[PDB]
Amino acid sequence: SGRAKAVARLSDLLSTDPLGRLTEVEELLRAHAPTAADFARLFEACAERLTRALAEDRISRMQVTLAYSALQMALRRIHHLPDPQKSVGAVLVAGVPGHKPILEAALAAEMLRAVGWSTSVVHPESVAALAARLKTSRTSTLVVAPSLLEGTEQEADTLRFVSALRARTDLPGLSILVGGRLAQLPPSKLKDSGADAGFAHLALLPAALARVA
Amino acid sequence: SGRAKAVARLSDLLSTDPLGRLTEVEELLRAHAPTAADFARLFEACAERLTRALAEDRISRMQVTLAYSALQMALRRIHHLPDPQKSVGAVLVAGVPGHKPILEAALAAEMLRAVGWSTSVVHPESVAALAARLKTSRTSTLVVAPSLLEGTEQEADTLRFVSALRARTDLPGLSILVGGRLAQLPPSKLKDSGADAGFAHLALLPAALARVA
């Protein structure tokens, strides 16, 4: 299928010269990712390899950082849908304060716009700043975008963030969806945390979003 | 002037929600920065504003990081010229190790490609890595890209980088251009570091390069 091959080749470019060979990175991505869901699947496969390479000291934090930025520029180059004319609903896609899931959040938005959600991305300074946004925009669904390559969220940190949001009394019937490592928790222990649904991988977000909203 | 208001509006967008309002950022940039040189001049004016605001604790370093990333994505959406197959010359645009002028290096490449130079971007790990690169590709002109949104410490790092680079015995024929605050140095101080000429502002790089061929 040249799926594993795409991953290998792209992983290699990202590890050696992501910003110098950006054009080749993009060619590979637009050839193997017609949709943002395909991009996301490709990204997570590559992130597994870079993460392993970092763990084995075959690359540096700086190299992962350069690859991450390269991927962001590649994504906007390839995928950039406007809001749907008439949406199926309003979704807010947000990172955990102190973290910056830039690619993941933008990948999330592109998937949900692709099937008719009016989406907005937010990188909030704090819980209080996010809550203020929620009310003001009267949004009913919040997707917490996981950081999957660098500046990852410790499980207890996303949980605390979700809890803090719930702890407030100015959020009625809000749908919270969480990703990354939290989505590996049992359904029981998840609703206990305040999340209504987990999505184990980015591409699984649209299916998860339909089941709850 | 028009550019005045555009700088103010872009700076405000970047200071508040650059990643959530990425479309507006792009739209502003398409209307006010139709060439990469215009983009550079616009980024440079905003960087000054963001630097001041950061120094005054009116914004966080996190905010600046998000602004910078949004500008990377916008830039790749709008300007992405192919490398001239028949070029007027071969220029290497490099970042300084320990720094990541991702946007400035990309801007430099766009501006040079726009006037017919074959250009490559590299973010090298070290002096040795760039040196080897300079050899294998027989580069005759090196442009060191400044980080307009990093602090004054980069000056020393750049002087040291360029000095160590010039000190090497395996790079004949090489012109070196530096930018940012270093291009405000007196000519003799500039030459002493190993550099040959400066570009005081990003937009002036094409003309600076012409002078040293």
Side-chain angles (χ1 to χ4, degrees):
Chain A
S1 169
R3 172 73 193 183
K5 258 51 186 173
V7 169
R9 181 159 37 208
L10 179 65
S11 281
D12 176 78
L13 290 181
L14 294 171
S15 299
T16 55
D17 193 9
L19 296 166
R21 306 180 69 179
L22 191 54
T23 302
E24 295 165 79
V25 166
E26 288 171 353
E27 289 171 5
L28 190 157
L29 288 169
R30 67 170 73 249
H32 288 97
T35 75
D38 294 286
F39 198 110
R41 210 170 289 109
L42 229 43
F43 162 64
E44 292 196 60
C46 292
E48 161 213 336
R49 300 201 180 192
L50 294 175
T51 294
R52 197 164 58 93
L54 179 69
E56 299 175 350
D57 287 328
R58 297 185 290 105
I59 61 183
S60 65
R61 293 198 175 275
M62 179 54 89
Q63 277 166 290
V64 172
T65 294
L66 296 182
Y68 192 57
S69 302
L71 280 178
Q72 299 165 26
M73 299 173 94
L75 175 66
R76 194 64 184 175
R77 177 66 165 95
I78 299 172
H79 302 294
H80 37 262
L81 297 163
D83 269 329
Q85 295 173 26
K86 189 181 292 85
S87 72
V88 200
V91 174
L92 188 71
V93 179
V96 175
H99 297 262
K100 54 196 174 76
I102 298 181
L103 190 76
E104 301 85 345
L107 277 167
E110 291 293 319
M111 294 183 277
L112 304 185
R113 291 192 176 199
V115 293
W117 298 90
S118 174
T119 78
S120 183
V121 175
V122 66
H123 290 284
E125 305 175 302
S126 71
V127 166
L130 181 59
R133 172 69 174 262
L134 291 164
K135 292 142 71 178
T136 311
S137 314
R138 310 186 302 185
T139 47
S140 62
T141 317
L142 162 64
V143 179
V144 191
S147 290
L148 298 173
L149 181 54
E150 69 178 8
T152 61
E153 292 89 32
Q154 295 297 111
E155 185 190 88
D157 285 334
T158 307
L159 288 187
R160 182 175 73 240
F161 171 69
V162 175
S163 173
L165 272 176
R166 289 300 193 193
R168 308 175 48 104
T169 64
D170 49 344
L171 296 319
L174 175 67
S175 302
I176 303 177
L177 285 80
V178 293
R181 63 199 69 194
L182 263 69
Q184 323 310 323
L185 287 161
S188 163
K189 271 68 181 181
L190 200 66
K191 195 232 183 187
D192 200 348
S193 64
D196 301 276
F199 53 100
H201 295 282
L202 293 190
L204 299 189
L205 172 60
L209 181 56
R211 305 187 312 253
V212 71
Chain B
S1 66
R3 203 178 311 258
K5 172 169 284 182
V7 167
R9 170 87 176 131
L10 181 54
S11 288
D12 282 334
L13 283 177
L14 298 170
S15 292
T16 52
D17 196 19
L19 290 170
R21 313 176 58 167
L22 183 52
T23 305
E24 290 161 79
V25 174
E26 289 172 350
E27 288 176 350
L28 192 159
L29 289 159
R30 289 181 192 272
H32 290 88
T35 72
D38 290 311
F39 195 118
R41 180 179 304 102
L42 210 55
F43 165 61
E44 179 150 356
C46 295
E48 182 171 19
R49 292 181 54 114
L50 288 179
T51 293
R52 192 172 181 262
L54 176 63
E56 283 169 7
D57 197 30
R58 284 189 287 106
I59 51 178
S60 74
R61 178 53 84 172
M62 172 58 78
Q63 291 181 266
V64 176
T65 302
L66 301 178
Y68 194 62
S69 287
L71 284 173
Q72 286 170 27
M73 312 180 76
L75 172 60
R76 196 53 178 188
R77 167 88 169 89
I78 307 171
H79 300 296
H80 42 251
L81 291 167
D83 198 52
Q85 304 172 6
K86 290 79 183 161
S87 48
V88 292
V91 183
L92 193 52
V93 176
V96 173
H99 307 260
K100 27 187 190 60
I102 296 169
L103 189 74
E104 298 85 341
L107 284 173
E110 284 310 308
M111 290 186 289
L112 299 176
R113 287 186 179 194
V115 294
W117 300 92
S118 186
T119 75
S120 311
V121 168
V122 60
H123 292 280
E125 248 187 354
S126 60
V127 173
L130 182 57
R133 174 71 160 86
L134 283 174
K135 288 190 58 176
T136 55
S137 59
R138 309 137 75 98
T139 270
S140 59
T141 307
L142 174 71
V143 175
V144 182
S147 302
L148 294 188
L149 288 171
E150 288 178 48
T152 65
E153 184 172 336
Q154 75 181 279
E155 290 156 42
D157 297 347
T158 307
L159 291 179
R160 295 175 121 187
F161 184 59
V162 173
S163 178
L165 201 69
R166 187 61 82 184
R168 291 181 67 100
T169 59
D170 58 351
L171 315 164
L174 188 56
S175 288
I176 302 182
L177 304 183
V178 296
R181 298 162 95 270
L182 293 174
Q184 297 302 327
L185 290 181
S188 183
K189 283 199 159 187
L190 198 32
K191 296 271 191 203
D192 172 74
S193 77
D196 292 313
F199 47 104
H201 298 285
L202 286 194
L204 308 174
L205 173 67
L209 174 55
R211 305 192 302 260
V212 289

